[PDB]
């Protein structure tokens, strides 16, 4: 009567040299890391990702805890993760590993220290640099719950870490979302957790109608769709990241816009154009072969952006009149009309931006995440 359900994940990728962790490194030290889950629940799983590692990778030890802010957890709740029975897991080249199953007291939106004391570990690391969130690094292997970090090396990054399930009843389900930066959060705050999948999470898990919806936030920052780009494209990982989810019923596209931004001229842009199209619709068929419903975001605007050129925003528009009008997808999530200028509907709105005319702020997050129905999350 219970199953698998996703309530966090972050989506994995070989971390590039400018993002790698600052000394004293992971090999022999331990890193303390913090999520926020979506929908709370009781008996948990944890998963760990070696997708994009060359070299095998030691954890001896594996604690959680409801962290307090910053670098301190409450330690009266601190638990040591199992695999197979052992504190110590080693993930082979290429591969991940799913803790034990673990009872913990997981509250919707609670705030989750996961603290890794290593032991060998990879030159090439898989990780999420994206994160939006501090993590905390020490030498040595120090995953007592008493460990002082309040000293340690901070990196706005995440390494590693690549999930958290839960066991729900038939009601509970998730949304997976595939996107680029605009999705995993550039220009939202720093460990304020205010991502535009944040705010729908919010959102949902105050209509009490959707409270046992989870959100989980698939978005690489600077990732392509069909080639180049940041991290792994979006239809290299589809399966992984979208499919091979626990739980999931909604998919919801909104990508593209690095493609275009990569384009050189109008053959190619147009090109780009065609290409993303027809990878909507590959992937709207591959998610309803599995039974899941697939919204696509319009993509929003370029102008003023160091991307802007006249035949890529000639792309954008056949982009975005072909999600708005095919009918492949099943909804239309039109983030391109909640977050573009109403006296200049090519241009972010000024005080929803970044800075840079491309990246929304915390503002236009919270304002995306509105424009979202809730009634699209039915069970």
């Given at each position: 009567?219970?199953?698998?359900?996703?309530?966090?994940?972050?989506?994995?990728?070989?971390?590039?040299?400018?993002?790698?962790?600052?000394?004293?490194?992971?090999?022999?030290?331990?890193?303390?890391?913090?999520?926020?889950?979506?929908?709370?629940?009781?008996?948990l799983?944890?998963?760990?990702?070696?997708?994009?590692?060359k070299?095998?990778?030691?954890?001896?030890?594996?604690?959680?805890?409801?962290?307090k802010?910053?670098?301190?957890?409450?330690?009266?709740?601190?638990?040591?993760?199992?695999?197979?029975?052992?504190?110590?897991?080693?993930?082979?080249?290429?591969?991940?590993?799913?803790?034990?199953?673990?009872?913990?007291?997981?509250?919707?939106?609670?705030?989750?220290?996961?603290?890794?004391?290593?032991?060998?570990?990879?030159?090439?690391?898989?990780?999420?640099?994206?994160?939006?969130?501090?993590?905390?690094?020490?030498?040595?292997?120090?995953?007592?719950?008493?460990?002082?970090?309040?000293?340690?090396?901070?990196?706005?990054?995440?390494?590693?870490?690549?999930?958290?399930?839960?066991?729900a009843?038939?009601?509970?389900?998730?949304?997976?979302?595939?996107?680029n930066?605009?999705?995993?959060?550039?220009?939202?705050?720093?460990?304020?957790?205010?991502?535009?999948?944040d705010?729908?999470?919010?959102?949902?898990?105050?209509?009490?109608?959707?409270?046992?919806?989870?959100?989980?936030?698939?978005?690489?920052?600077?990732?392509?769709?069909?080639?180049?780009?940041?991290?792994?494209?979006?239809?290299?990982?589809?399966?992984?990241?979208?499919?091979?989810?626990?739980?999931?019923?909604?998919?919801?596209?909104?990508?593209?816009?690095?493609?275009?931004?990569?384009?050189?001229?109008?053959?190619?842009?147009?090109?780009?154009?065609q290409?993303?199209?027809?990878?909507?619709?590959?992937?709207?068929?591959?998610?309803?072969?599995?039974?899941?419903?697939?919204?696509?975001?319009?993509?929003?605007?370029?102008?003023?952006?160091?991307?802007?050129?006249?035949?890529?925003?000639?792309?954008?528009?056949?982009?975005?009149k072909?999600?708005?009008?095919?009918?492949?997808?099943?909804?239309?999530?039109?983030?391109?009309?909640?977050?573009?200028?109403?006296?200049?509907?090519?241009?972010?709105?000024?005080?929803?931006?970044?800075?840079?005319?491309?990246?929304?702020?915390?503002?236009?997050?919270?304002?995306?995440?509105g424009?979202?129905?809730?009634?699209?999350?039915?069970?």
């Amino acid at each position: 009567s219970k199953s698998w359900v996703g309530t966090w994940a972050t989506a994995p990728q070989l971390v590039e040299p400018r993002n790698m962790p600052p000394a004293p490194g992971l090999t022999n030290s331990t890193l303390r890391q913090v999520v926020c889950v979506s929908i709370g629940g009781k008996q948990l799983q944890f998963r760990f990702s070696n997708r994009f590692s060359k070299s095998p990778v030691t954890m001896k030890t594996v604690h959680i805890a409801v962290s307090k802010g910053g670098s301190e957890i409450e330690p009266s709740t601190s638990k040591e993760l199992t695999f197979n029975g052992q504190p110590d897991v080693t993930m082979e080249p290429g591969k991940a590993v799913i803790s034990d199953p673990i009872s913990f007291n997981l509250k919707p939106r609670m705030l989750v220290a996961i603290t890794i004391s290593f032991g060998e570990t990879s030159p090439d690391v898989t990780g999420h640099p994206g994160s939006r969130t501090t993590s905390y690094l020490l030498a040595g292997d120090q995953s007592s719950p008493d460990a002082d970090f309040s000293q340690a090396v901070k990196t706005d990054h995440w390494y590693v870490i690549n999930g958290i399930d839960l066991m729900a009843q038939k009601r509970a389900a998730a949304i997976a979302i595939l996107g680029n930066s605009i999705t995993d959060g550039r220009g939202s705050g720093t460990n304020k957790q205010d991502r535009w999948p944040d705010e729908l999470a919010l959102r949902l898990l105050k209509n009490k109608r959707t409270r046992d919806i989870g959100v989980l936030n698939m978005g690489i920052g600077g990732n392509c769709v069909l080639h180049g780009g940041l991290g792994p494209t979006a239809l290299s990982r589809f399966n992984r990241d979208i499919l091979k989810q626990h739980g999931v019923r909604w998919l919801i596209i909104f990508e593209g816009v690095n493609d275009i931004g990569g384009t050189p001229d109008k053959e190619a842009a147009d090109k780009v154009a065609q290409g993303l199209i027809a990878a909507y619709d590959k992937m709207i068929d591959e998610a309803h072969a599995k039974g899941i419903k697939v919204y696509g975001g319009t993509i929003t605007p370029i102008k003023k952006s160091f991307y802007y050129k006249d035949y890529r925003e000639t792309a954008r528009q056949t982009v975005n009149k072909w999600i708005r009008t095919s009918g492949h997808f099943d909804a239309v999530i039109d983030f391109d009309k909640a977050m573009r200028n109403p006296k200049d509907t090519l241009t972010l709105r000024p005080e929803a931006q970044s800075g840079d005319y491309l990246h929304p702020n915390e503002l236009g997050y919270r304002i995306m995440a509105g424009a979202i129905d809730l009634s699209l999350f039915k069970e």
